[PDB]
A paper describes a structure:
Non-polio enteroviruses (NPEVs) from the family of Picornaviridae are nonenveloped viruses composed of (+) ssRNA genomes that infect humans and cause a variety of human diseases.
Through iterative rounds of focused classification, we reconstructed maps featuring structurally distinct polyclonal antibodies bound to epitopes at near-atomic resolution (structurally distinct polyclonal antibody class—pAbC). We resolved two distinct polyclonal antibodies targeting Site-1 and three against Site-2. The highest achieved global map resolution was 3.8 Å (pAbC1-1), although the local resolution was worse for the pAb-corresponding part of the map. Given the polyclonal nature of bound antibodies and the inherent lack of sequence information, the variable Fab domains (Fv) were represented as poly-Alanine models. Specific epitope contacts and angle of approach were highly similar for Site-1 antibodies while Site-2 pAbs displayed greater diversity; consistent with nsEM analysis. Overall, we observed a high degree of similarity in epitopes for several of the antibodies. For example, Site-1 overlaps with the binding sites of 14B10 (15), 5F5 (16), and 2G8 (26) mAbs; the overlay of pAbC1-1 and 14B10 mAb structures is shown in the Supplementary Material Appendix—Fig. S7A.
Residue numbers in the entry:
A (entry chain e): 17 to 298
B (entry chain f): 8 to 272
C (entry chain g): 1 to 234
D (entry chain c): 97 to 192
E (entry chain h): 2 to 69
Amino acid sequence: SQPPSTQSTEATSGVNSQEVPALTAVETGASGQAIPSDVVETRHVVNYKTRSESCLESFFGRAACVTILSLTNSSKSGEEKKHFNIWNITYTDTVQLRRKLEFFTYSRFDLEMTFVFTENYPSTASGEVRNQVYQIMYIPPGAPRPSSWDDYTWQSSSNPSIFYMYGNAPPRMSIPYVGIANAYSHFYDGFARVPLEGENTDAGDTFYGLVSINDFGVLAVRAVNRSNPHTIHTSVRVYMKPKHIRCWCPRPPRAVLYRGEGVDMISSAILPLAKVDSITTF
Amino acid sequence: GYSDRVRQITLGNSTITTQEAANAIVAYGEWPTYINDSEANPVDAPTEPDVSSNRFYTLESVSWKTTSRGWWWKLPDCLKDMGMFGQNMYYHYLGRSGYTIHVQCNASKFHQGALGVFLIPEFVMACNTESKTSYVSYINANPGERGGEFTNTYNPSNTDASEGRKFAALDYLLGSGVLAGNAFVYPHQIINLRTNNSATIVVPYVNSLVIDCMAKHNNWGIVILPLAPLAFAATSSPQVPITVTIAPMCTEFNGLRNITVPVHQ
Amino acid sequence: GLPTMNTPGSNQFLTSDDFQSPCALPNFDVTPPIHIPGEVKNMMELAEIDTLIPMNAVDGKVNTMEMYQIPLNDNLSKAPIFCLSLSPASDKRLSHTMLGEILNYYTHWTGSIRFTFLFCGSMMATGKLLLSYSPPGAKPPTNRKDAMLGTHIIWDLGLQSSCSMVAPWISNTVYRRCARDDFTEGGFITCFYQTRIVVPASTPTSMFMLGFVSACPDFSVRLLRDTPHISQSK
Amino acid sequence: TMLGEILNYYTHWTGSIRFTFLFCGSMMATGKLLLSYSPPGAKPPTNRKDAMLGTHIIWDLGLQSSCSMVAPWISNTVYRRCARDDFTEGGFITCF
Amino acid sequence: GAQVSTQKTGAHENQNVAANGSTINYTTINYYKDSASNSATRQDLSQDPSKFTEPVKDLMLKTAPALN
Ligand SMILES: CCCCCCCCCCCCCC(=O)O
């Protein structure tokens, strides 16, 4: 049927009573509940507006760029190691996506990934190069990981993968919720393990937070082509769009610039507000 | 009839009365309950103490001075040596509990000031070094009933390994980069000295798991801030105590093993 | 096979597209849900929570805790206590509240806004404060005389500690632009002493109040946009 | 006390005992007190933390000027001896 | 086995009623059987702000003193 609208306003009139919507006690933890009909005379208004843009599914329904990977296909031997790039999967590489996710403490969603490729020549001289193909392989935590672009793991006998020919539409794939827990945590107030009385008093220093517990594997991305005289540099933009999303606990959004994968602050950015000239400036 | 201000909370072998509370809050509208069979993770036979761990405990008091910038606690941690709750969290690998958090602070009618009491799930705080990230020792991260304090100065050390293992507990950013003014999103109550002398918040267990390991993770933290300064006007330096009293409730444990004894100083 | 034609839009990639993609992990058994307290379904549920306004973010107060404390005195004054422009995603002091930050993800907004003030003075002190809203066609309500010709509430400080003012959705449009403009003028918010705060012997003469802002139930937003507040280097 | 005087005519007694405290200060003054009973055995509650682990009530001073703490009848016997007989230790009552 | 559902209305839709016209419809077919492959879900405007704005054990009415 018709999607439910936001609050309509009834007509009201003057009041002289012991009922007092104007006063409350925010100490109770409750917000004030006053609406215009409680403090001013109002006219009747039918409200047909809906909160659809603001639904969480809508709010998060955008493919954000998360990371950029660099691949280089070159005949120069020192570039062999650059033919292949490994990405540690995270959403923390980009501030807009992590900031939106960090409005919530926990969330559950399925994930859509999109891979957008751009090629150019980093060299001082270009020339003919045949069309390249790229392989995106997902390597789950603990799975064998390649040492080179031409290693044995690329056979992809287990690890799922995508083969993309440059110039076609960007690949897009969907990953079902894969957290071990029943929701992904965006914060973890704890340690990966508990150091005991027989250990160093500074123990735990290096294994605190979400960073020490989550491991989502890596993206092993390589050009699959043989080297050519003219080097091709490829920029791979990895996008994420969470969908079918539920969130379980609101938080203040971060007000300051991020420093790394945790909640760490840089002193140069701990001043989030602009100054005003006066408390009385309109 | 009954007033809203007057209340009695009874759990286990202890009772708390109050004559000046702004009701009580049940975070997210939910009470602590025991795990339903349909959601259970472990297949161990659970331990469910009835009136042992589920009693109120009083944490070491802190003082409210006009120069304090706030106080904080990690919740499971603050009760780690508290009788049976303490012993059960160390004997069992896993455990779960909700809490009743009661904060007390007396003042006369001539005093003014206000304390915001906020309960923050996953209260993750920033390290105090710019050379490392998510860096904090177990010991500094988990101070016990003593809690910690907030400051208004960020003085990280990119060279001193010892200071870097302490938290960068700024008051205005709640130690994590979020303006405190938005802290109100979390369940909270205000001990406004001209209105209340106490606050009560009922806390359900909130996690991604039905049950977790208590020696590793602090499900909730407690943050108390001087939202409005203390003043008496009959002294150059007024002082009132703040005392936090906590009871676990609907507590259960699994994974019985040798008692865990964490690194400590 | 079926004859087809490829219409415009084929092979583009759109950020906001809605189209089925193949599953990466076919037959994957997804970890079952449990109930987790605190479920949020809509961003407006958070917009309606009262959060503090950094009303006093002036030199020496900016980015310190004191920016949230509005001073009050037992002294004679005909001056405004504070002033605010009612533009939630523009005014420097309103933009960073929870309501402000949520609105910084939207292009337009509508509905009424509530301002709640909590007196954090002594119990022995009393007084009356005038809170008001004056729609945009007005010149700035600089004097109490201008403030009292608009929408206003006289707040008697007493047994109940706080008072909520509602600034109704008075507009020449349906939704106002979140971004600052000249056209979508917010209107003015201010406060004056209605009387004076009267303080007895041995009671502090310098009090504070905490202002809060939240969305009303008729509140909504139109289109999603990225927030201007968080930067990133390359 | 009247209870003691009646019990001094008996060799054995049983049942819970109530301790009620009336605050007689000014009306303007406020504060809180901890009233606590510990079962017999172990070391006495010489500080607040130990008193706290026992049976206790927090008394908020206000209009209701009188708080009742009840020492439940926790015992390993049926009746306790009235005499200070170590077979039937009383338990401890403190206020902090 | 397609599912027909009402479309969100737009610029040329005469009624905000959203129950006027047989044309405000779209057809969804789920082509993949793994549910993660399904397109974005339906709008759901169910809300419960009381969890965050009035989480008070003892119900109080807005017209009554907040504190009795
Ligand atoms: C062939 C390439 C497919 C790559 C699949 C990677 C799936 C990653 C799941 C999302 C993990 C991030 C969620 C979180 O940090 O809370």
